[PDB]
């Protein structure tokens, strides 16, 4: 176990291996957020028998700390891909604050890349594995209500973001055209950009956002959402990354689609720089 709730020390001349897809911490966070989700049950007190009885789901930066006998190592290389040996590594008592945001397609309120846009993956050949993209410059998205709702994005900032992401994806597939298409199918949770905002689940259609084909100012995009749990409701989130899934490689093109659904991908995007070891 790893206890969930400020000191750090660098380890001079130490090299320890990290594996993005084999991380006991990502397994831990997945179980802990599942446990907190399951608390949509009535609390209980006791007088004679089991007598059955704050909707503040709003995320707060939580931390994962090392219990006695265990330590947490952190990779200080800010371009670290997730898998392989890290040269610059330190012992930290607790991980940085992590807002446990459960969104699909777009990663909201996370940490930005240090430098350029980063594909957080040693290799993206495996089509089954989700591609975690980390953006260096954030993109605002205002979602509002008066059932149904809508979201707005700057447009010139969005189609610019996808252009810089397509150039950086083309580094992995040189001499290949990079295309984006909407989600190919499945449940509404994954086919749309879904997320929780003050007791409300949104399901925003992203077909207009992901329909670009890249060869080798005050305008906005408005996307419609379905709502399922005040008259007016609003969220002003910040897109910090994307979750993509690659189709089967065709002739001279590579198609990417917004992915999600696996809640472990959301925790991989933040915990890719940590590892639990024994003291």
């Amino acid at each position, epitope marked *: 176990t790893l206890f969930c709730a400020p000191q750090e020390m660098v380890l001079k001349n130490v090299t320890e291996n990290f594996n993005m897809w084999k991380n006991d911490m990502v397994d831990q966070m997945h179980e802990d957020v599942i446990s907190l989700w399951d608390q949509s049950l009535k609390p209980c007190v006791k007088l004679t028998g089991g007598s059955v009885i704050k909707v503040s789901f709003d995320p707060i930066p939580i931390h994962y700390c090392a219990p006695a006998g265990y330590a947490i190592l952190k990779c200080n290389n800010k371009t670290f891909t997730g*898998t392989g040996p890290c040269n610059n590594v330190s012992t930290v008592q607790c991980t940085h604050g992590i807002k446990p945001v459960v969104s699909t397609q777009l990663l909201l309120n996370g940490s930005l890349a240090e430098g350029e846009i980063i594909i957080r993956s040693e290799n993206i*050949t495996n089509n089954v594995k989700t591609i975690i993209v980390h953006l260096n410059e954030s993109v605002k998205i205002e979602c509002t209500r008066p059932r149904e709702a809508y979201c707005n994005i700057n447009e010139s900032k969005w189609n610019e973001t996808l252009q810089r992401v397509s150039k950086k994806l083309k580094e992995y597939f040189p001499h290949k055209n990079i295309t984006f298409q909407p989600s190919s199918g499945g449940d509404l949770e994954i086919t749309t950009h879904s997320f929780n905002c003050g007791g409300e689940f949104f399901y925003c259609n992203t077909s207009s956002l992901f329909n670009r084909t890249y060869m080798a100012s005050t305008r906005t995009i408005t996307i419609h959402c379905r709502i399922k749990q005040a008259g007016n409701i609003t969220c002003i989130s910040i897109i910090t990354g994307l979750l993509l899934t690659r189709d*089967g490689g065709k002739n001279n093109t590579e198609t990417f689609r917004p992915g999600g*659904g*696996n809640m472990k991908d959301n925790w991989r995007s933040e915990l890719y720089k940590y590892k639990v070891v024994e003291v």
Partner: antibody, heavy 121, light 114 residues
Framework: QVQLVQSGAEVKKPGASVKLSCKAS????????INWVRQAPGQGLEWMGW????????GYAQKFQDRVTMTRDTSTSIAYMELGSLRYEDTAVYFC??????????????WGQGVPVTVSG | DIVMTQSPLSLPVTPGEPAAISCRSS????????????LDWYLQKPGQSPQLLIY???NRASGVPDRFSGSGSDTDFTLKISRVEAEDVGVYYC?????????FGQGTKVEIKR
């Protein structure tokens, strides 16, 4: 205990569609994938695509991309695969198989008994 | 497509003696983001559906007898049988599970030498 039962045998005319079933039982249906693999008579094996029965995510083989639809019904642990615009070259036995999720959809550890699908006039 | 090349296509074996089948892929099957090598060995006995023998190069599937064994690295793989029993007759296909489409070898017909 772990079984993958399939729907007998079908005969369809050229241009038509088929919807094959694959009833899973004896294990956690949503914690394992369902892949479909076909076999022409006397020929080898050909993978068609996968599905994540938990959320419905799919990934098809490029040659079947715009003519196949894989879906599931978690209320009955049944997995479907619909192949449209049938050509005579689709006459083959169609198997469904249990695979992995997250790291890969491979490691076909359990298999259905197959369904012959003749395509002819 | 990652073409999978099996050698040999035919293999008659006197029962009790050992057998080996090679599989060679046009690309590496090591998932560098994971550390795992996605290669499986399937057996299709006559008039039956296929079945898993080995997964990820060397791991035996449940029930598979210790006679069967896998080995190899990166691009060359070998399924080995120590004692070729009567039940082992069938077509053996290697298979990569790394990139779409998942591709199989052409098959190896193992039969009794007479």
């Amino acid at each position: 205990q772990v079984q993958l039962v399939q729907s007998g045998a079908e005969v369809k005319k050229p241009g038509a569609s088929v919807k094959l079933s694959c009833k899973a039982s004896g294990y956690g249906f949503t914690i394992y994938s369902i892949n479909w693999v076909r076999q022409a008579p006397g020929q080898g094996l050909e993978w068609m695509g996968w599905i994540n029965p938990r959320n419905g995510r799919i990934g098809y083989a490029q040659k079947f991309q715009d003519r196949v639809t894989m879906t599931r019904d978690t209320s009955t642990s049944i997995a479907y695969m619909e192949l449209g615009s049938l050509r005579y070259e689709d006459t083959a036995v169609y198997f469904c198989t249990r695979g992995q999720l997250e790291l890969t959809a491979s490691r076909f550890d359990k298999w259905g008994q197959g369904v012959p699908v003749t395509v002819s006039g | 497509d990652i073409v999978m090349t099996q050698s040999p296509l035919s293999l008659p074996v006197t029962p009790g003696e050992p057998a080996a089948i090679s599989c060679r892929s046009s690309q590496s099957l090591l998932d560098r983001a994971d550390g795992n090598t996605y290669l499986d060995w399937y057996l299709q006995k006559p008039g039956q559906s296929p079945q898993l023998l080995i997964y990820e190069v060397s791991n035996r599937a449940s029930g598979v007898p210790d006679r069967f064994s896998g080995s190899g690295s990166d691009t060359d793989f070998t399924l080995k049988i120590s004692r070729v029993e009567a039940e082992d007759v069938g077509v053996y296909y290697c298979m990569q599970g790394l990139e779409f489409p998942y591709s199989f070898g052409q098959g190896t017909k193992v039969e009794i030498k007479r």
